[PDB]
Ligand binder design. Structure first.
Ligand SMILES: Nc1ncnc2c1ncn2[C@@H]1O[C@H](COP(=O)(O)OP(=O)(O)OP(=O)(O)O)[C@@H](O)[C@H]1O
Ligand SMILES: [Mg+2]
Lengths: 49, 48, 148, 212, 198
């Protein structure tokens, strides 16, 4: 189990996601997913016009 | 969180210097082009 | 409007031709003669003078047509003799202007059978000048020489 | 049946190798170039066929690797069929500084455009100026001539990192440039909060980084 | 899609190694039994495969294969030194008739060193080492070192095969003809080779 956590610790992407606790990083990633979804919605609306 | 993390690393690099690896495939060797030497012969002939 | 036309084709120091000028026709021009006479060579000279891009020129046999072969030899070098060579076209523009385009060809000394090309163009040449005479010097008793 | 692509190769792999973008990308990847998000054509192509390319290059004993920041690159093994090389220590100093620039929100106002002078100033701000000077010239003691030599060496290394894809010059100005996310590989020794020596040993065992 | 025979060819286990060697510029002769046979079998498709890189796959009339880059080559190019072509033309000369009786195909570094020194002009030798040099022992030692270095480069090109021991004795392959002169009807190879070396 310790090995699994050590393995995951390195795989964090950038500063705003640097909660060294992986499980805590999950929700920040999903927050980014939601943010990205909103941006995509606005952009595709622009594309239509 | 990283400010300390990275700044100390730069400060103390030379106590444990390390280097990354990259792919460095070889270049294709080719003949050096010698100065172009054309064939000059001052050809002559009977005109039709 | 009067469309432009190709007046003539000139070859100098090609394989079998020393200095020859074919006068083209307004509609159709035909070349005849036994095998190996030199018809395809005349075709090749024309197209070379039209598109001197040496990366493209590739003169396959009529047999093996359509086969992308990557042959070792493009087949142009052998159609040239040693020394300097020319290939030129005379054209009458829609504006009734006489313009002479062409290329200077020359074999490259060395194991690789390479060729050198240098295009050129002439404008305003008097109608009385023939390219065959313009490209040669009369040395000796009717024994003309080609000039670089 | 016989004479059928599936006999020799997966269809998706053949489809990838037949694409018009493959030769450019293969030539660059073997040269060591890193691929980020900005060059959409190449990055999207890599994402579409990732597993096929990884299985293909495995024949050469090299791993096609994807960093968490989303950039691909090649890491040769010990029995690699493709040669392998290591960066200089000055390259590392400038690389870590470029990373610290990318993170820095105080300079986010620049909107990504940095100047060589700013990079030099930051580098001298953090490192030991005179003792780092030892590598430029063994007799340097702060002379302006030697300072200019340091600046020019920095300029040259920055150009080399441009070839690796770590930085893009502006289309018309070569004195200013924009960063890419690939620079984060310079942080591989600190991204985990643990004992540095064990990190170093794991990196060297994984083939990421050699000593000097 | 992709031609079936091309997919077969590049699926073969020998391809990755041959690709790595070819992109480095190595020449494949009749000596490399398996590689040469592989190229003979799949030339028609490999030529097309490498044309996608703006690089030409040529089979020399003597029989050996090699790649020639165009100006628009997608593979980064590199170029040999003057001393390199000098040594190459020397090796082409040594591929002589009396060679068979003189050495039975196996030469030594000293043969080449002495031939190079004897046949070349002094001025271009100085240009090779350094213009400030003048007939000094250290210059000759440096020239020997450079000869060994360029000979190893040529070995990487496949021109010359070292006999498997630490000593510097080797044999010359047919692919050395790439340095050779143009041949005209009835011309003697010795004379034309010397004419270029002069
Ligand atoms: N590259 C070359 N090298 C050497 N000889 C050549 C070359 N190309 C053509 N020839 C020779 O030049 C002569 C003219 O050939 P060419 O094809 O022009 O003749 P042709 O009258 O068009 O013949 P055909 O109608 O049979 O095609 C022939 O002897 C041919 O063998
Ligand atoms: Mg014909």
């Amino acid at each position: 189990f310790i090995a699994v956590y050590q393995h995951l610790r390195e795989r964090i992407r950038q500063d705003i996601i640097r909660t060294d606790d992986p499980v805590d990083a999950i929700e920040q990633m999903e927050i980014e997913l939601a943010r990205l979804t909103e941006e995509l919605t606005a952009r595709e609306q622009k594309l239509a016009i | 969180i990283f400010s300390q993390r990275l700044r100390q690393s730069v400060q103390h690099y030379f106590d444990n210097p390390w280097t990354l690896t990259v792919a460095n495939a070889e270049r294709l060797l080719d003949m050096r082009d010698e100065e172009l030497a054309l064939r000059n012969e001052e050809v002559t002939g009977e005109l039709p | 409007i009067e469309r432009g036309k190709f007046r003539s084709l000139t070859l100098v120091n090609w394989n079998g031709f020393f200095a020859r000028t074919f006068d083209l026709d307004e509609l159709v021009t035909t070349l005849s003669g036994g095998n190996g006479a030199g018809k395809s060579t005349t075709m090749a000279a024309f197209v070379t003078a039209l598109i001197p891009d040496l990366t493209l020129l590739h003169f396959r046999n009529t047999t093996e047509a359509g086969a992308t072969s990557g042959s070792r030899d493009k087949g142009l070098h052998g159609k040239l003799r040693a020394g300097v060579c020319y290939s030129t076209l005379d054209v009458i523009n829609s504006r009734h202007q006489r313009v002479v385009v062409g290329v200077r060809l020359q074999q490259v000394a060395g194991r690789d059978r390479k060729v050198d090309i240098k295009p050129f163009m002439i404008q305003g040449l008097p109608t009385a000048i023939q390219p065959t005479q313009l490209l040669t010097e009369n040395v000796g008793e009717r024994q003309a020489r080609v000039l670089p | 049946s016989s004479t059928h692509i599936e006999q020799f190769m997966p269809v998706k792999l053949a489809q990838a190798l037949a694409n018009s973008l493959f030769p450019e990308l293969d030539s660059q990847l073997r040269a060591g170039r890193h691929i980020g998000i900005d060059d959409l054509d190449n990055h999207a192509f890599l994402m579409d066929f990732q597993e096929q390319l990884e299985e293909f290059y495995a024949r050469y004993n090299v791993e096609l690797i994807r960093a968490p920041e989303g950039f691909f690159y090649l890491r040769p093994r010990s029995t690699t069929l493709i040669p392998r090389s290591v960066l200089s220590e000055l390259d590392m100093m400038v690389g870590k500084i470029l990373c610290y620039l990318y993170l820095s929100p105080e300079r986010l106002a620049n909107q990504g455009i940095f100047t060589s002078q700013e990079l030099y100033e930051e580098l001298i701000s953090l490192a030991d100026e005179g003792k780092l000077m030892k590598f430029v010239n063994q007799r340097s003691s702060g002379s302006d001539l030697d300072k200019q030599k340091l600046q020019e060496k920095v300029r040259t290394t920055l150009n080399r990192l441009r070839r690796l894809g770590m930085v893009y010059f502006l289309p018309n100005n070569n004195n200013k440039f924009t960063i890419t996310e690939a620079v984060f590989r310079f942080g591989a020794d600190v991204r985990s909060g643990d004992d540095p020596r064990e990190i170093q040993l794991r990196m060297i065992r994984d083939g990421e980084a050699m000593p000097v």
